[PDB]
Amino acid sequence: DIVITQDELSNPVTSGESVSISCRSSRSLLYKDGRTYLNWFLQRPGQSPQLLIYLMSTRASGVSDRFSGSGSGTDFTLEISRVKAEDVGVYYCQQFVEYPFTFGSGTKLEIKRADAAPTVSIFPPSSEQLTSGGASVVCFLNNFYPKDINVKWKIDGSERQNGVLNSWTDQDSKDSTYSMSSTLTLTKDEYERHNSYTCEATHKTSTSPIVKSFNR
Amino acid sequence: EVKLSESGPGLVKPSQSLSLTCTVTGYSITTNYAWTWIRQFPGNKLEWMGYIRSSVITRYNPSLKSRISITQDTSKNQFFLQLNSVTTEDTATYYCARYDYYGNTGDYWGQGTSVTVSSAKTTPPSVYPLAPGTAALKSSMVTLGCLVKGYFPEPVTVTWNSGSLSSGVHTFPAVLQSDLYTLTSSVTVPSSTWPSQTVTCNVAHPASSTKVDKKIVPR
Numbered sequence: 001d002i003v004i005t006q007d008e009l010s011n012p013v014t015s016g017e018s019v020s021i022s023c024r025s026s027r028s029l030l031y032k033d034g035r036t037y038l039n040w041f042l043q044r045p046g047q048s049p050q051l052l053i054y055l056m057s058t059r060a061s062g063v064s065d066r067f068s069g070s071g072s073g074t075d076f077t078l079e080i081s082r083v084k085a086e087d088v089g090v091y092y093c094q095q096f097v098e099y100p101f102t103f104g105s106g107t108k109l110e111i112k113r114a115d116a117a118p119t120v121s122i123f124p125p126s127s128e129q130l131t132s133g134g135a136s137v138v139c140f141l142n143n144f145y146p147k148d149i150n151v152k153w154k155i156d157g158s159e160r161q162n163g164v165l166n167s168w169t170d171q172d173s174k175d176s177t178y179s180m181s182s183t184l185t186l187t188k189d190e191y192e193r194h195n196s197y198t199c200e201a202t203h204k205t206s207t208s209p210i211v212k213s214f215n216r
Numbered sequence: 217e218v219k220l221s222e223s224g225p226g227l228v229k230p231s232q233s234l235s236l237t238c239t240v241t242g243y244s245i246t247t248n249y250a251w252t253w254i255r256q257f258p259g260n261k262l263e264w265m266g267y268i269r270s271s272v273i274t275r276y277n278p279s280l281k282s283r284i285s286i287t288q289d290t291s292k293n294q295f296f297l298q299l300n301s302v303t304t305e306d307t308a309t310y311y312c313a314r315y316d317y318y319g320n321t322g323d324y325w326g327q328g329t330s331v332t333v334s335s336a337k338t339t340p341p342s343v344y345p346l347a348p349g350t351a352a353l354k355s356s357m358v359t360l361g362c363l364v365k366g367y368f369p370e371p372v373t374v375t376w377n378s379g380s381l382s383s384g385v386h387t388f389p390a391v392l393q394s395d396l397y398t399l400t401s402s403v404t405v406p407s408s409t410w411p412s413q414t415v416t417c418n419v420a421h422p423a424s425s426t427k428v429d430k431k432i433v434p435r
């Protein structure tokens with residue numbers, strides 16, 4: 001029914017800065033009783049949504065007074081004062097004037113922190129996996145910032161693109177870094193055809209890749 | 217105190233019904249709220265599904281057509297979601313919540329229950345230890361891990377030393393391929409503590425009633 005639109009945050013916010021997050025409604029949420037029925041929620045990485053504000057400007061019980069809401073009848077703003085690492089997550093608005101009570105699609109808050117190079121670790125396939133005929137080589141690239149990162153696999157000095165699956169964590173609520181795992185999966189027999197396996201991480205913190213390798 | 221807890225199957229086959237239970241704790245379900253179901257899709261869009269109020273009065277999102285029923289069992293302090301004729305598009309995390317007239321939910325949103333709608337077979341993970349190839353810069357930190365391969369459906373829970381190892385852990389989102397998921401978890405500990413002190417990953421997959429411990433032993 002009502003479509004709620006949220007603005008993207010173009011830029012990460014350093015701890016201690018304040019930031020405004022906005023949402024808009026296709027219809028006025030100001031009701032005949034003078035109250036404006038707009039909720040804001042925070043969904044922290046991996047958790048259920050937590051109500052921050054209802055009735056456009058009333059803080060939910062227990063919510064930090066760093067959060068405040070304002071707006072007219074169709075444009076709304078959540079102000080987060082003195083942002084903390086733990087404020088990272090997705091902020092959603094919801095209207096409560098017309099059924100069904102639709103949600104916006106969320107605004108992700110990213111925290112800006114000092115650049116950090118990844119700690120890179122490479123692991124050979126386990127003997128348990130090899131007995132089943134499989135061979136996964138795992139590389140962790142942990143606790144880096146900013147999120148942009150490239151991993152390249154090399155086998156006996158040649159780039160390998162197939163059989164690689166990557167996964168990235170959300171931003172950490174404590175230290176504001178990111179991590180990534182890259183797994184190269186081969187058969188045991190393919191694995192046994194080569195000797196040197198290399199994971200190479202390229203990140204803004206150095207012009208030269210961080211290279212971790214082992215020999216089978 | 218006052219909280220809400222969802223339960224129900226994590227996997228349902230297409231065309232069958234999805235049933236979930238919300239148990240209200242601390243407080244009687246006869247208090248006058250809109251006892252609500254919300255779901256969150258992969259990609260994180262939220263959808264209001266419907267409510268029950270006053271034990272017997274309901275309203276639903278027209279998006280759900282005639283497929284949804286919410287009911288209540290006052291004697292158990294529970295309300296229920298039944299969503300019929302499911303398809304893969306009903307795969308989501310389902311939440312229950314308590315709404316009041318002003319839109320206030322308080323802290324009353326459930327933890328969420330993942331429901332996957334799929335014809336794929338429940339499969340427990342194989343859990344493989346990730347131990348470092350040889351030695352490296354010691355007197356500092358060592359990273360270990362666990363590869364959790366080939367399970368269905370989500371989720372798995374990974375802990376290290378039964379939860380005693382909590383700092384320095386990264387459990388990565390799973391990746392799905394050929395109806396099986398794979399995920400890894402890393403832990404970083406002082407080189408002084410391993411291998412002299414044991415490190416074990418504990419991997420639970422409730423959907424298949426399986427829990428596995430894998431001790432990480434040096435190569």
Ligand SMILES: COC(=O)[C@H]1[C@@H](OC(=O)c2ccccc2)C[C@@H]2CC[C@H]1N2C
Binds near residue numbers: 031098269
């Ligand atoms: C569609 O009904 C509403 O949105 C109303 C109200 O919602 C309900 O009356 C209601 C009834 C049953 C379940 C959930 C909400 C929320 C606020 C206050 C009045 C009005 N709205 C502006």
